[PDB]
């Protein structure tokens, strides 16, 4: 097994997945890594079998169609390895924690949002529909790109909006286009 976090790429106390060469933070594993279970597969290792035993969930999907899914166990986990996988990148840190606004020329948002916050409302199965956790995570971005307005910083937004947008496409099989 890898001897660094898959998520935060630091040592420390780490949960080896039995099924992959993964490891793991406690709570950097979505869902928190579990109690006892031996084995215990990591959240890659259950969405590769997903994939497994139904081959055709990978052709083309529409968007709109996902959106609409109930989060039923299946939709609950890769919704769960998609903020997972926004974790997974450094700048997410950005995002994670809870933001405040005050800045020249600037107003907070209405309805703030931030992963630790999305992270809190999948545990608790707070979204009934994939789209209640998609909406979330796009606000995040949205009210960065807003707030920052032309400051450079607005950037951050960007580039962990393309993270997630890449990783719902790819999790969800949307249908690829141009
Ligand atoms: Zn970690
Ligand atoms: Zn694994
Ligand atoms: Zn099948």
Not at 5 to 19: P, S
Not at 67 to 91: A, G, I, N, W
Not at 108 to 124: I, R, Y
Request: hydrophobic share 30%; charged share 25%.
């Amino acid at each position: 097994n890898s001897n660094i976090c898959e998520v935060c790429n630091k040592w420390g106390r780490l949960f080896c997945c039995d099924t992959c060469p993964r490891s793991f933070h406690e709570h950097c594993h979505i869902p928190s890594v579990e109690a006892n279970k031996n084995p215990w597969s990591c959240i890659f290792c259950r969405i590769k079998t997903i994939q497994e035993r139904c081959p055709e969930s990978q052709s083309g999907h529409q968007e709109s169609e996902v959106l609409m899914r109930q989060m039923l166990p299946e939709e609950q986990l890769k919704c769960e390895f998609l903020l997972l996988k926004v974790y997974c990148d450094s700048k997410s840190c950005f995002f994670a924690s809870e933001p405040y606004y005050n800045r020249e020329g600037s107003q907070g948002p209405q309805k703030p949002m931030w992963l630790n916050k999305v992270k809190t409302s999948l545990n608790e199965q707070m979204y009934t529909r994939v789209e209640g956790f998609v909406q979330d995570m796009r606000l995040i971005f949205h009210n960065h790109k807003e707030f920052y307005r032309e400051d450079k910083f607005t950037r951050l937004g960007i580039q962990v909006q393309d993270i997630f947008e890449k990783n719902f496409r790819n999790i969800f099989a949307i249908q690829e286009t141009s």
